[PDB]
Each structure stands twice: as structure tokens, then as C-alpha cells.
Design a protein around this ligand. Sequence first.
Ligand SMILES: Nc1ncnc2c1ncn2[C@@H]1O[C@H](COP(=O)(O)OP(=O)(O)OP(=O)(O)OP(=O)(O)OP(=O)(O)OC[C@H]2O[C@@H](n3cnc4c(N)ncnc43)[C@H](O)[C@@H]2O)[C@@H](O)[C@H]1O
Ligand SMILES: [Mg+2]
Ligand code: NA
Length: 214
Amino acid sequence: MRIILLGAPGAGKGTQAQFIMEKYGIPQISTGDMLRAAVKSGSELGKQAKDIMDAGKLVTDELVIALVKERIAQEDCRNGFLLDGFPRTIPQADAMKEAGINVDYVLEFDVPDELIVDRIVGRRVHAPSGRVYHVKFNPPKVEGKDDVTGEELTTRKDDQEETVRKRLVEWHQMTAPLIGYYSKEAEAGNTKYAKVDGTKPVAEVRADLEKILG
Ligand SMILES: Nc1ncnc2c1ncn2[C@@H]1O[C@H](COP(=O)(O)OP(=O)(O)OP(=O)(O)OP(=O)(O)OP(=O)(O)OC[C@H]2O[C@@H](n3cnc4c(N)ncnc43)[C@H](O)[C@@H]2O)[C@@H](O)[C@H]1O
Ligand SMILES: [Mg+2]
Ligand code: NA
């Protein structure tokens, strides 16, 4: 199975990706996680993203397209994959199409703009896995600790309010058109498209997604 997670910053894509990955046995491909990992390791493919992410801007298409091509070429992706935060622009989506990458589902995560800042300012992450928590809305079992490894959680450099507001502008201008892009693809029979209410509790969004994915 091949799935695209689509949605504004903090809509809950990464959170729900964890369950989808476990349930259907396909790897999570998060361009955000991959770019951040590249910056941390000083990897030649992706380290350039550092200043761009700080500014709250989108990384260039050709850079993220290359990262995705390399990643989904790995053997853990021969049986399907979960694209999380990719594609983020029309050229990224067309690049998939040109590459002949079919998808089964496009899942839109809907949240009001007014919830996004308070979500991301309370976000804590386990960088090695990509697991995500929230100090108020979805805390770990033990404070500041990853539930699975027990390792110390961290705060993303780009998760301050001002940076979030800039990512939100970027999403409305560059990414929002992908709703129509894939809705049109769905009408042509090339994929299914579904929208979920991401304001519900984590467990319920999970249930709604399971109902869609069967
Ligand atoms: N294709 C691409 N092309 C170009 N540039 C790219 C790119 N991909 C990345 N980049 C670059 O990387 C930068 C960062 O992008 P990115 O890594 O995608 O971060 P983002 O813009 O902040 O949005 P996310 O996708 O990480 O949020 P999310 O939908 O996964 O929500 P989450 O589960 O975390 O949840 C949010 C918070 O709310 C909590 N929460 C989750 N669900 C719920 C719920 N139901 N109820 C209450 N709280 C919840 C969570 O615990 C969490 O704390 C970009 O600016 C760009 O420069
Ligand atoms: Mg994500
Ligand atoms: Na398809």
C-alpha cells in the first residue's frame, strides 16, 4: 500500500503515521525527519536545509525529490510506503507522476489555523525514530522520555511561534493546491482521497484512519 499524508503544520500527520506504519507494515517517509537527520549528521545530501528550515521556508524541490528517490529505493519500500510531508508542492507531485509512482490513498488532515501554534510550541520529539509527543495534549508516559526507548526527548529548533506562522503561510501558498491536485486524481480513479478531522483525540483520529484504510 502507498499513502500520502497531506495537511497543514501540526495537523497530526507524524503522530498518525506511527500507527499506519505498524498496522500495514510500511515505512514512514518523513521529509522533515530526513532533512533534520541530514543536518544533524552533516550529510552532503540534505545538510543545506539547515538555514532554510530555520527561516520556516520550504527546501528546494530538487533537494527533497532526491532524498525521497534515494529513500524509497531501499528494500524496506518494495512493498509499499507512507509519504509523510511529501509531496509539498505541485512540482514534487508531478515528479512522482513522471517517475510512475502510483498511490492508493491521499489522506488530508484538517485542523483550524488557530490550533496550530499551541500544538507546535508544546511538541517534543524522539529524533532517532521520529516519534512525536505534546506536553499537554499527548504527553509521554514519563516526562521528557521516549515511551519506546526511554531516551531523552528534544525540542525542534524551528518550533517557535514565529517560525510556525511562516510555515503556515508557506502551506497555504504552496501546498494547499495539492488538495485539488489529488482530489482530481481521485476522480480519475488514480487514487482514493479522504479528509479527516484532526481535532479529535489521537485515538479517534487513528480509528477514523483505520476505517478508511480498511
Ligand atoms: N517536501 C518538503 N519539501 C520542501 N521542504 C520540506 C519538505 N518537508 C520538510 N521540509 C522542510 O522541513 C521543515 C519542517 O517541516 P515538517 O517537518 O513537515 O514540520 P511541520 O511543518 O511543523 O509540520 P509536521 O508535518 O511536522 O506536523 P504534523 O502534521 O506531523 O503534526 P504532528 O503529528 O507533529 O502533531 C503536532 C503536535 O500536536 C500533537 N498532536 C498530534 N495529534 C494530536 C491530536 N489528535 N490531538 C491533540 N494533539 C495532537 C502532537 O503530539 C504534536 O506535538 C519545512 O519547513 C521545510 O523547510
Ligand atoms: Mg509529519
Ligand atoms: Na492508484
